[PDB]
Design a protein around this nucleic acid. Sequence first.
DNA 1: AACACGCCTAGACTCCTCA
DNA 2: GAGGCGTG
DNA 3: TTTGAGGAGTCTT
Length: 592
Amino acid sequence: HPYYLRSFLVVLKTVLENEDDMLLFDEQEKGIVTKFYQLSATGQKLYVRLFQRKLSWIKMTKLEYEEIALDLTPVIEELTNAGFLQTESELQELSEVLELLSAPELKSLAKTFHLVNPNGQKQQLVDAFLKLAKQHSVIGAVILKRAKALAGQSVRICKGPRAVFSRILLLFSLTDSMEDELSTVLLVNLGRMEFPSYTINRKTHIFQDRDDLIRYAAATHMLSDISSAMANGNWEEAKELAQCAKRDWNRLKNHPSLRCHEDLPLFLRCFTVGWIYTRILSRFVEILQRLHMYEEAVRELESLLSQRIYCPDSRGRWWDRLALNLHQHLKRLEPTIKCITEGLADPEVRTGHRLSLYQRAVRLRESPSCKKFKHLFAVQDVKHVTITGRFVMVLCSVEELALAHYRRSGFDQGIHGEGSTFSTLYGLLLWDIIFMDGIPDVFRNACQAFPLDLCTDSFFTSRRPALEARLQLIHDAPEESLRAWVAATWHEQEGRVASLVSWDRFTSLQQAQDLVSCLGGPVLSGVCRHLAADFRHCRGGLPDLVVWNSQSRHFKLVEVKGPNDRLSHKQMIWLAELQKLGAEVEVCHVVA
DNA sequence: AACACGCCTAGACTCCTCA
DNA sequence: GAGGCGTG
DNA sequence: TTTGAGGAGTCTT
Ligand SMILES: [Ca+2]
Ligand SMILES: [Ca+2]
Ligand SMILES: [Cl-]
């Protein structure tokens, strides 16, 4: 089986064995999946090749697949019988036949049918052919017959069966996505990936019925379209699309299904239509801000912050952003102070957005403009250091240069991993708690790299006594214990796809063992507590470098900065917090 | 010099059709 | 979201 | 005529 079919069969098996997910398919749709498994390998191979391509008519001219068969005529015929794949005889709409033809093929057609401009562009010829065929039905039937003859043998994928596989992938996709935005990396690799072993346990339903899923899926397409508009810098298209989404979401706000969604725990409530429209409303405030409609942007941010149902984790980003627009763009210092107060009060705002609001506070208590207002009332200081480059040493990064400085300054051993180094160690020390039994709805299918609550407050609370026991054990751990825990997870789990664990991060198991030994129990314990407590807001801002001396076991955690980049809020909080745990932290600056 | 802010980024590549 | 570049 | 920017396709055993 080649990579594309391997990946497809994994996706299918994973979703079908899920009884509760299969409630969202009528018995005919389940029949189409049964029909696919009754196909030959070559039938399956070819269908997947066409499934991955644009939903459009394809000339058998253009269909080459050496690894399937030399001629695909019997393979197409199997898929035709099964009802997966139309042929010439089904191609009847004139618009569709004209699209399928080449510019020279339409030119010679336009000569025979005496069009006004036979040397015109394809679309003009197509629009012209459609006008003629409409006006004079008799001619239209000749155009259709003439076009189909030039078109030759061609084939299209049936939208009915396609839609069943689209929905299977949509259900499969939910659990692969840890962050917000078949996909390429999975299409290629998914067949070969071995996943952590855990116990699937589904107490709760995500979608009420088939109609609920279709409305989710539609909002997903709308979210996808809005992002693509913003990506291509078509900010007017995006505004209307976001306005359509706001209308479509407004129409739906009464529907009974939404009341079941409100009752889902946050780690499942992400997989609900209302969450997707809320995320579209986050994209809307982004578009309004780019079009300099800051009054309009602030209404939507106030609207979003007025509820706690959908995207609580985004509230930190919303408050910080509301404070900015009221302060710098609208110049309303009285709302700014209220916004910041309500912001800093809210226990959903964390780390960078917490600090950023507090930094905007100390900028107003020490500002002549806000003397007419009341009193209006931190981070620890860190050793900054400077070195020099030309960058070359031949061509090197800012981090590679700093590593050589720490190598010359005695630290023979070093890793430039940013957040992956502590994330992997966190994954390696707490694997068995990460994938532990007895939390319902967190393991729903066989291809998860994480429990669905990992990036939620639920993760720590749901595992509170087990984590506290391990966190304390790690704090009081001799190097023999740390080396043994890392070794246990390594030898049992090496290669297993876990979101937290980059297996290639450490050059060997020995390097992982050597590093935890230098870091020590108290440091590792505190890092693991933070990442377990609130991965969503503590994942980012860990320092670029760990450097350590292989004899002394002196180590520095270093955030490398080039000429023009300051500490982010999340970086300076991590430096302070690693200093409190009693590790030497440094900002290694670089200059020309 | 520093700092706060807006803005853009989005995989890497082949091949071939047609403005 | 995070990072890189340009602006005042 | 002559051509190259953009879109569809492809990627891992
Ligand atoms: Ca690090
Ligand atoms: Ca850096
Ligand atoms: Cl991006």
